[PDB]
Amino acid sequence: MQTDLFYTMKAAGSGGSGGSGGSQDLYATLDVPAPIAVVGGKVRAMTLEGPVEVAVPPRTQAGRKLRLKGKGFPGPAGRGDLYLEVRIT
Structure with missing residues (x-):
C-alpha cells in the first residue's frame, strides 16, 4: 500500500526541526x-494524498508534534512534512 510509517525517526520526543527556509511544512x-496514545496503537491521519492509518508512538501526551514525510509541499529540504497536533480524548 501507499506507505508504512514516517515519524518512527522522531515522534515520542521529536524536539523540533526546521522552522525556516520555504513554507514546505x-x-x-x-x-x-488516551489508551491508544499511552500504548501507541493506530489512528487516521489526513494528508495531501488523503487518509493514512498511522501507528501512534508509545507515551504520546496531548500536544506532541508528529512528522509525516512527503505529506507537505516540496521546498527547502525538497520534501515538506505534515505536523500532526495530537489530541488526547
Whole structure:
C-alpha cells in the first residue's frame, strides 16, 4: 500500500526541526484517545494524498508534534512534512 510509517525517526520526543527556509511544512490535527496514545496503537491521519492509518508512538501526551514525510509541499529540504497536533480524548 501507499506507505508504512514516517515519524518512527522522531515522534515520542521529536524536539523540533526546521522552522525556516520555504513554507514546505504543513499542519494537521490527529485525534487519538488516551489508551491508544499511552500504548501507541493506530489512528487516521489526513494528508495531501488523503487518509493514512498511522501507528501512534508509545507515551504520546496531548500536544506532541508528529512528522509525516512527503505529506507537505516540496521546498527547502525538497520534501515538506505534515505536523500532526495530537489530541488526547
